[PDB]
Amino acid sequence: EVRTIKVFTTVDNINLHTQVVDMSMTYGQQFGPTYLDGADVTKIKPHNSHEGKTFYVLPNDDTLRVEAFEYYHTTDPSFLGRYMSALNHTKKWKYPQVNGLTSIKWADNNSYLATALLTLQQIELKFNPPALQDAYYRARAGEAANFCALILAYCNKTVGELGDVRETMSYLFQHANLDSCKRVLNVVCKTCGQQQTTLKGVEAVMYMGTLSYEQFKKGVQIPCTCGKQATKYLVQQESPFVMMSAPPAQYELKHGTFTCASEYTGNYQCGHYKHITSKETLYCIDGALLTKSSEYKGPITDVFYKENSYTTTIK
Numbered sequence: 254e255v256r257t258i259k260v261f262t263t264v265d266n267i268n269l270h271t272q273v274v275d276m277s278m279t280y281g282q283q284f285g286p287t288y289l290d291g292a293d294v295t296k297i298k299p300h301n302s303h304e305g306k307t308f309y310v311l312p313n314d315d316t317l318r319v320e321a322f323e324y325y326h327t328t329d330p331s332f333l334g335r336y337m338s339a340l341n342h343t344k345k346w347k348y349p350q351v352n353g354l355t356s357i358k359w360a361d362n363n364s365y366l367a368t369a370l371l372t373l374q375q376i377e378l379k380f381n382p383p384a385l386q387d388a389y390y391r392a393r394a395g396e397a398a399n400f401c402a403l404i405l406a407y408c409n410k411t412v413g414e415l416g417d418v419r420e421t422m423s424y425l426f427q428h429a430n431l432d433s434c435k436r437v438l439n440v441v442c443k444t445c446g447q448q449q450t451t452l453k454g455v456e457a458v459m460y461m462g463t464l465s466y467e468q469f470k471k472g473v474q475i476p477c478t479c480g481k482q483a484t485k486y487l488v489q490q491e492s493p494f495v496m497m498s499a500p501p502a503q504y505e506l507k508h509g510t511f512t513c514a515s516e517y518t519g520n521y522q523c524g525h526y527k528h529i530t531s532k533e534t535l536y537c538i539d540g541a542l543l544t545k546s547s548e549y550k551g552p553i554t555d556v557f558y559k560e561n562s563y564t565t566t567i568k
């Protein structure tokens with residue numbers, strides 16, 4: 254009009270798109286929903302200090318649609334808005350190094366994210382979306398704000414919302430390369446006989462029902478459709494880790510028999526997570542807080558174990 258500045262729009266913060274904006278109109282009137290490092294500036298008119306800065310927008314043409322899918326591996330229409338909304342919060346969190354790992358200082362009910370982030374740094378896992386690759390690299394270095402906002406966006410969780418570690422890990426594992434992972438199970442019923450099943454990928458590394466990998470190898474009791482209790486046990490495992498999950502229950506964690514674990518104190522509407530890692534001793538990381546003990550007992554929900562190749566001796 255009479256007065257303009259040059260800004261750049263983006264969906265991935267790498268590929269920039271030159272724009273000339275009218276300082277008399279809001280960003281929303283010109284771009285649609287618009288964000289400046291997570292802050293919603295849709296209703297704001299351009300400032301002088303905005304010249305040359307990069308703004309996120311929603312993927313509103315074909316070029317941006319392709320850039321956003323290639324970077325994030327999602328076409329959920331609300332993804333970018335939810336990522337920006339989360340980032341406006343996570344950029345204000347603190348990410349202390351605790352016993353050599355990036356943690357998160359407690360804020361905004363984020364304890365499930367802290368133990369998920371701590372867990373990732375202890376298992377062998379490679380992400381597929383460049384957005385996660387790039388943000389996870391930064392998180393390992395201690396700048397985890399973008400990674401944490403992406404976890405929230407990928408899980409369709411908002412800042413402050415109750416989260417579950419197992420479900421969160423499931424979303425992240427969908428976006429990781431677990432194609433090599435393989436699990437063979439056998440289920441034995443004294444009435445019906447035996448039935449083997451093979452699982453691949455994410456389903457090959459997660460199990461819900463018991464925390465103990467050794468018990469999974471010996472056999473766990475599950476219902477059979479005939480009504481009797483059958484025994485399910487692990488026949489073969491090919492993966493760099495496994496994750497064993499269960500409803501929270503008092504459970505004893507022995508030094509040297511697991512990699513790390515999550516503990517949940519509370520109920521189905523309200524609770525708090527802590528992280529336990531087995532190193533030279535047992536360390537309990539609760540956000541920024543750190544304690545140690547030689548033995549540990551608590552309401553454990555998830556335990557992670559190292560693996561490479563396992564074959565049963567059960568005939």
Ligand SMILES: [Zn+2]
Binds near residue numbers: 442478479
């Ligand atoms: Zn049966």
